[PDB]
């Protein structure tokens, strides 16, 4: 098992609604919420289910990233971003295009903190999307930004064999 965590409803933008169980975040502009964990070792896998949201960003941030600055427009933030029909990854304000299978519904995030990688997957189809190589300077927390509809996180997952 990798690090189990929930959304921290205290980290959540006033324009977001975090659910009772702290696993879904909905919109009622960097509308964001963090995982309630800082990771500074090991390998960790979690997924996000996307219920038809056309504007969102899923990723990781140093503590030094200010609240709701989590869409990869600084040096402390890495994010997979849907921008309507356009999917990019963003770190340090660099927008790097990716080409997912249409109707990307379930996204895998594999953080290898020790070896210094953030890998994004189409978890449903077992397609690698992009890997960030990082020499992590600080602990990182998962981050979720959503502009419409909702996201659901699944955490504490084994590192799957159905990916590579």
CSV table of N, CA, C and O in Angstrom, one decimal, residues 73-149:
chain,number,residue,atom,x,y,z
A,73,UNK,N,2.0,26.7,-12.7
A,73,UNK,CA,2.4,28.1,-13.1
A,73,UNK,C,3.4,28.6,-12.1
A,73,UNK,O,3.5,29.9,-12.0
A,74,UNK,N,4.2,27.7,-11.5
A,74,UNK,CA,5.4,28.1,-10.7
A,74,UNK,C,6.3,26.9,-10.5
A,74,UNK,O,5.9,25.8,-11.0
A,75,UNK,N,7.4,27.1,-9.9
A,75,UNK,CA,8.5,26.1,-9.8
A,75,UNK,C,8.2,25.1,-8.7
A,75,UNK,O,9.0,24.1,-8.5
A,76,UNK,N,7.1,25.3,-7.9
A,76,UNK,CA,6.8,24.4,-6.7
A,76,UNK,C,5.6,23.5,-7.0
A,76,UNK,O,5.1,22.9,-6.1
A,77,UNK,N,5.1,23.5,-8.3
A,77,UNK,CA,3.8,22.9,-8.7
A,77,UNK,C,4.0,22.1,-10.0
A,77,UNK,O,4.5,22.7,-11.0
A,78,UNK,N,3.6,20.8,-10.0
A,78,UNK,CA,3.4,20.0,-11.2
A,78,UNK,C,2.0,19.5,-11.4
A,78,UNK,O,1.4,19.1,-10.4
A,79,UNK,N,1.4,19.7,-12.5
A,79,UNK,CA,-0.1,19.4,-12.8
A,79,UNK,C,-0.3,18.8,-14.2
A,79,UNK,O,0.3,19.3,-15.1
A,80,UNK,N,-1.2,17.8,-14.2
A,80,UNK,CA,-1.9,17.4,-15.5
A,80,UNK,C,-3.2,18.3,-15.6
A,80,UNK,O,-3.9,18.4,-14.5
A,81,UNK,N,-3.4,19.0,-16.7
A,81,UNK,CA,-4.5,20.0,-16.9
A,81,UNK,C,-5.3,19.7,-18.1
A,81,UNK,O,-4.8,19.5,-19.1
A,82,UNK,N,-6.6,19.6,-17.9
A,82,UNK,CA,-7.6,19.7,-19.0
A,82,UNK,C,-8.0,21.2,-19.1
A,82,UNK,O,-8.4,21.8,-18.1
A,83,UNK,N,-7.9,21.7,-20.3
A,83,UNK,CA,-8.3,23.1,-20.7
A,83,UNK,C,-9.4,23.0,-21.8
A,83,UNK,O,-9.0,23.2,-23.0
A,84,UNK,N,-10.6,22.5,-21.5
A,84,UNK,CA,-11.7,22.2,-22.5
A,84,UNK,C,-11.2,21.0,-23.3
A,84,UNK,O,-11.3,19.9,-22.8
A,85,UNK,N,-10.8,21.2,-24.6
A,85,UNK,CA,-10.4,20.1,-25.5
A,85,UNK,C,-8.9,19.8,-25.4
A,85,UNK,O,-8.5,18.8,-25.9
A,86,UNK,N,-8.2,20.8,-24.8
A,86,UNK,CA,-6.7,20.7,-24.8
A,86,UNK,C,-6.3,20.2,-23.4
A,86,UNK,O,-6.6,20.7,-22.4
A,87,UNK,N,-5.4,19.1,-23.5
A,87,UNK,CA,-4.7,18.6,-22.3
A,87,UNK,C,-3.2,19.0,-22.4
A,87,UNK,O,-2.6,18.7,-23.5
A,88,UNK,N,-2.7,19.5,-21.3
A,88,UNK,CA,-1.3,19.8,-21.2
A,88,UNK,C,-0.8,19.2,-19.8
A,88,UNK,O,-1.7,18.8,-19.1
A,89,UNK,N,0.5,19.1,-19.6
A,89,UNK,CA,1.1,19.1,-18.3
A,89,UNK,C,1.8,20.4,-18.2
A,89,UNK,O,2.2,21.0,-19.2
A,90,UNK,N,1.9,21.0,-16.9
A,90,UNK,CA,2.5,22.3,-16.6
A,90,UNK,C,3.4,22.2,-15.4
A,90,UNK,O,3.0,21.6,-14.4
A,91,UNK,N,4.6,22.6,-15.5
A,91,UNK,CA,5.5,22.8,-14.4
A,91,UNK,C,6.3,24.1,-14.8
A,91,UNK,O,6.6,24.3,-16.0
A,92,UNK,N,6.4,25.0,-13.8
A,92,UNK,CA,7.3,26.2,-14.0
A,92,UNK,C,6.8,27.0,-15.2
A,92,UNK,O,7.6,27.6,-15.9
A,93,UNK,N,5.4,27.1,-15.4
A,93,UNK,CA,4.8,27.9,-16.4
A,93,UNK,C,5.1,27.4,-17.8
A,93,UNK,O,4.7,28.1,-18.8
A,94,UNK,N,5.7,26.2,-18.0
A,94,UNK,CA,5.9,25.5,-19.3
A,94,UNK,C,4.6,24.6,-19.5
A,94,UNK,O,4.4,23.7,-18.7
A,95,UNK,N,3.8,24.9,-20.6
A,95,UNK,CA,2.7,24.1,-21.0
A,95,UNK,C,3.1,23.1,-22.0
A,95,UNK,O,3.1,23.4,-23.2
A,96,UNK,N,3.2,21.8,-21.6
A,96,UNK,CA,3.7,20.7,-22.5
A,96,UNK,C,2.5,19.9,-22.9
A,96,UNK,O,1.8,19.3,-22.1
A,97,UNK,N,2.1,20.0,-24.2
A,97,UNK,CA,1.0,19.2,-24.7
A,97,UNK,C,1.1,17.7,-24.6
A,97,UNK,O,2.2,17.1,-24.7
A,98,UNK,N,0.0,17.0,-24.3
A,98,UNK,CA,-0.1,15.6,-24.3
A,98,UNK,C,-1.4,15.2,-25.1
A,98,UNK,O,-2.1,16.1,-25.4
A,99,UNK,N,-1.4,14.0,-25.5
A,99,UNK,CA,-2.5,13.5,-26.4
A,99,UNK,C,-3.1,12.3,-25.8
A,99,UNK,O,-2.7,11.1,-26.0
A,100,UNK,N,-4.2,12.4,-24.9
A,100,UNK,CA,-4.9,11.3,-24.3
A,100,UNK,C,-5.9,10.7,-25.3
A,100,UNK,O,-6.3,11.4,-26.1
A,101,UNK,N,-6.2,9.4,-25.1
A,101,UNK,CA,-7.4,8.8,-25.5
A,101,UNK,C,-8.6,9.7,-25.2
A,101,UNK,O,-8.7,10.2,-24.0
A,102,UNK,N,-9.6,10.0,-26.1
A,102,UNK,CA,-10.7,10.9,-25.7
A,102,UNK,C,-11.5,10.3,-24.6
A,102,UNK,O,-11.4,9.2,-24.4
A,103,UNK,N,-12.2,11.2,-23.9
A,103,UNK,CA,-13.0,10.7,-22.7
A,103,UNK,C,-12.1,10.1,-21.7
A,103,UNK,O,-12.4,9.0,-21.2
A,104,UNK,N,-11.0,10.8,-21.3
A,104,UNK,CA,-10.1,10.4,-20.2
A,104,UNK,C,-10.9,10.6,-18.9
A,104,UNK,O,-11.4,11.7,-18.6
A,105,UNK,N,-11.2,9.5,-18.2
A,105,UNK,CA,-12.2,9.4,-17.1
A,105,UNK,C,-11.5,9.1,-15.7
A,105,UNK,O,-12.0,9.5,-14.7
A,106,UNK,N,-10.4,8.3,-15.7
A,106,UNK,CA,-9.7,7.9,-14.5
A,106,UNK,C,-8.2,8.0,-14.7
A,106,UNK,O,-7.7,7.4,-15.6
A,107,UNK,N,-7.6,8.9,-13.9
A,107,UNK,CA,-6.2,9.4,-14.0
A,107,UNK,C,-5.4,8.8,-12.9
A,107,UNK,O,-5.8,9.0,-11.7
A,108,UNK,N,-4.3,8.0,-13.2
A,108,UNK,CA,-3.4,7.5,-12.2
A,108,UNK,C,-2.2,8.5,-12.0
A,108,UNK,O,-1.7,9.1,-13.0
A,109,UNK,N,-1.8,8.7,-10.8
A,109,UNK,CA,-0.6,9.5,-10.4
A,109,UNK,C,0.3,8.6,-9.7
A,109,UNK,O,-0.1,8.1,-8.6
A,110,UNK,N,1.5,8.3,-10.2
A,110,UNK,CA,2.6,7.6,-9.6
A,110,UNK,C,3.7,8.5,-9.2
A,110,UNK,O,4.3,9.1,-10.1
A,111,UNK,N,3.8,8.8,-7.9
A,111,UNK,CA,4.9,9.6,-7.3
A,111,UNK,C,5.9,8.6,-6.9
A,111,UNK,O,5.7,7.8,-5.9
A,112,UNK,N,7.1,8.6,-7.5
A,112,UNK,CA,8.3,7.9,-7.0
A,112,UNK,C,9.2,9.0,-6.4
A,112,UNK,O,10.0,9.6,-7.1
A,113,UNK,N,9.0,9.3,-5.1
A,113,UNK,CA,9.7,10.4,-4.4
A,113,UNK,C,11.2,10.1,-4.4
A,113,UNK,O,12.0,10.9,-4.7
A,114,UNK,N,11.6,8.8,-4.1
A,114,UNK,CA,13.0,8.4,-3.9
A,114,UNK,C,13.8,8.5,-5.2
A,114,UNK,O,14.9,9.1,-5.2
A,115,UNK,N,13.2,8.1,-6.4
A,115,UNK,CA,13.9,8.1,-7.7
A,115,UNK,C,13.5,9.4,-8.4
A,115,UNK,O,14.2,9.7,-9.4
A,116,UNK,N,12.6,10.2,-7.9
A,116,UNK,CA,12.3,11.6,-8.4
A,116,UNK,C,11.6,11.6,-9.7
A,116,UNK,O,12.1,12.1,-10.6
A,117,UNK,N,10.4,11.0,-9.7
A,117,UNK,CA,9.4,11.1,-10.8
A,117,UNK,C,8.0,11.2,-10.4
A,117,UNK,O,7.6,10.7,-9.3
A,118,UNK,N,7.2,11.9,-11.2
A,118,UNK,CA,5.7,12.1,-11.2
A,118,UNK,C,5.3,11.6,-12.6
A,118,UNK,O,5.5,12.3,-13.6
A,119,UNK,N,4.6,10.4,-12.6
A,119,UNK,CA,4.1,9.8,-13.8
A,119,UNK,C,2.6,9.9,-13.8
A,119,UNK,O,2.0,9.6,-12.8
A,120,UNK,N,2.0,10.4,-14.9
A,120,UNK,CA,0.5,10.4,-15.2
A,120,UNK,C,0.1,9.3,-16.2
A,120,UNK,O,0.8,9.1,-17.2
A,121,UNK,N,-1.0,8.7,-15.8
A,121,UNK,CA,-1.6,7.5,-16.6
A,121,UNK,C,-3.0,7.7,-16.8
A,121,UNK,O,-3.7,8.3,-15.9
A,122,UNK,N,-3.5,7.4,-18.0
A,122,UNK,CA,-4.9,6.9,-18.3
A,122,UNK,C,-5.1,5.6,-17.6
A,122,UNK,O,-4.6,4.6,-18.2
A,123,UNK,N,-5.6,5.5,-16.4
A,123,UNK,CA,-5.6,4.3,-15.5
A,123,UNK,C,-6.6,3.3,-16.1
A,123,UNK,O,-6.4,2.1,-16.0
A,124,UNK,N,-7.7,3.8,-16.7
A,124,UNK,CA,-8.7,2.9,-17.3
A,124,UNK,C,-8.1,2.1,-18.5
A,124,UNK,O,-8.4,0.8,-18.5
A,125,UNK,N,-7.3,2.7,-19.3
A,125,UNK,CA,-6.7,2.1,-20.5
A,125,UNK,C,-5.3,1.7,-20.4
A,125,UNK,O,-4.8,1.1,-21.2
A,126,UNK,N,-4.7,2.0,-19.2
A,126,UNK,CA,-3.3,1.7,-18.9
A,126,UNK,C,-2.3,2.3,-20.0
A,126,UNK,O,-1.5,1.6,-20.5
A,127,UNK,N,-2.6,3.6,-20.3
A,127,UNK,CA,-1.7,4.4,-21.2
A,127,UNK,C,-0.9,5.4,-20.3
A,127,UNK,O,-1.5,6.2,-19.6
A,128,UNK,N,0.4,5.4,-20.5
A,128,UNK,CA,1.3,6.4,-19.9
A,128,UNK,C,1.1,7.7,-20.7
A,128,UNK,O,1.0,7.7,-21.9
A,129,UNK,N,0.9,8.8,-19.9
A,129,UNK,CA,0.6,10.2,-20.5
A,129,UNK,C,1.9,11.1,-20.6
A,129,UNK,O,2.1,11.7,-21.6
A,130,UNK,N,2.6,11.1,-19.5
A,130,UNK,CA,3.8,12.0,-19.3
A,130,UNK,C,4.5,11.6,-17.9
A,130,UNK,O,3.8,11.2,-17.0
A,131,UNK,N,5.8,11.7,-17.9
A,131,UNK,CA,6.6,11.6,-16.6
A,131,UNK,C,7.4,12.9,-16.4
A,131,UNK,O,8.3,13.2,-17.3
A,132,UNK,N,7.3,13.6,-15.3
A,132,UNK,CA,8.2,14.6,-14.8
A,132,UNK,C,9.3,13.9,-14.0
A,132,UNK,O,9.1,13.2,-13.1
A,133,UNK,N,10.6,14.2,-14.4
A,133,UNK,CA,11.8,13.9,-13.6
A,133,UNK,C,12.1,15.1,-12.8
A,133,UNK,O,12.1,16.2,-13.3
A,134,UNK,N,12.3,14.9,-11.5
A,134,UNK,CA,12.4,15.9,-10.4
A,134,UNK,C,13.4,15.4,-9.4
A,134,UNK,O,13.2,14.3,-8.9
A,135,UNK,N,14.4,16.2,-9.0
A,135,UNK,CA,15.2,16.0,-7.7
A,135,UNK,C,14.4,16.9,-6.7
A,135,UNK,O,14.7,18.1,-6.6
A,136,UNK,N,13.5,16.2,-6.0
A,136,UNK,CA,12.6,16.9,-5.0
A,136,UNK,C,13.4,17.5,-3.9
A,136,UNK,O,14.2,16.7,-3.2
A,137,UNK,N,13.3,18.8,-3.6
A,137,UNK,CA,14.0,19.6,-2.6
A,137,UNK,C,13.2,19.6,-1.3
A,137,UNK,O,13.9,19.7,-0.2
A,138,UNK,N,11.9,19.4,-1.3
A,138,UNK,CA,11.0,19.5,-0.2
A,138,UNK,C,10.0,18.4,-0.2
A,138,UNK,O,9.8,17.7,-1.2
A,139,UNK,N,9.2,18.2,0.9
A,139,UNK,CA,8.0,17.3,0.8
A,139,UNK,C,6.9,17.8,-0.1
A,139,UNK,O,6.9,19.0,-0.4
A,140,UNK,N,6.1,16.9,-0.7
A,140,UNK,CA,5.1,17.3,-1.7
A,140,UNK,C,3.7,16.8,-1.2
A,140,UNK,O,3.7,15.7,-0.5
A,141,UNK,N,2.7,17.5,-1.5
A,141,UNK,CA,1.3,17.1,-1.2
A,141,UNK,C,0.5,17.1,-2.5
A,141,UNK,O,0.8,17.9,-3.4
A,142,UNK,N,-0.4,16.1,-2.7
A,142,UNK,CA,-1.3,16.0,-3.8
A,142,UNK,C,-2.1,17.3,-3.9
A,142,UNK,O,-2.4,17.8,-2.9
A,143,UNK,N,-2.5,17.7,-5.1
A,143,UNK,CA,-3.3,18.9,-5.3
A,143,UNK,C,-4.4,18.6,-6.3
A,143,UNK,O,-4.1,17.9,-7.3
A,144,UNK,N,-5.6,19.3,-6.2
A,144,UNK,CA,-6.7,19.1,-7.1
A,144,UNK,C,-7.4,20.4,-7.3
A,144,UNK,O,-7.8,21.1,-6.3
A,145,UNK,N,-7.4,20.8,-8.5
A,145,UNK,CA,-8.1,22.1,-9.0
A,145,UNK,C,-9.2,21.7,-9.9
A,145,UNK,O,-8.9,20.9,-10.8
A,146,UNK,N,-10.4,22.2,-9.7
A,146,UNK,CA,-11.6,22.0,-10.5
A,146,UNK,C,-12.4,23.2,-10.7
A,146,UNK,O,-12.6,23.9,-9.7
A,147,UNK,N,-12.8,23.5,-12.0
A,147,UNK,CA,-13.5,24.8,-12.3
A,147,UNK,C,-15.0,24.4,-12.6
A,147,UNK,O,-15.8,25.4,-12.5
A,148,UNK,N,-15.3,23.2,-12.9
A,148,UNK,CA,-16.7,22.8,-13.1
A,148,UNK,C,-16.9,21.2,-12.9
A,148,UNK,O,-15.8,20.5,-13.0
A,149,UNK,N,-18.1,20.8,-12.5
A,149,UNK,CA,-18.3,19.4,-12.1
A,149,UNK,C,-17.5,19.0,-10.9
A,149,UNK,O,-17.2,19.9,-10.1
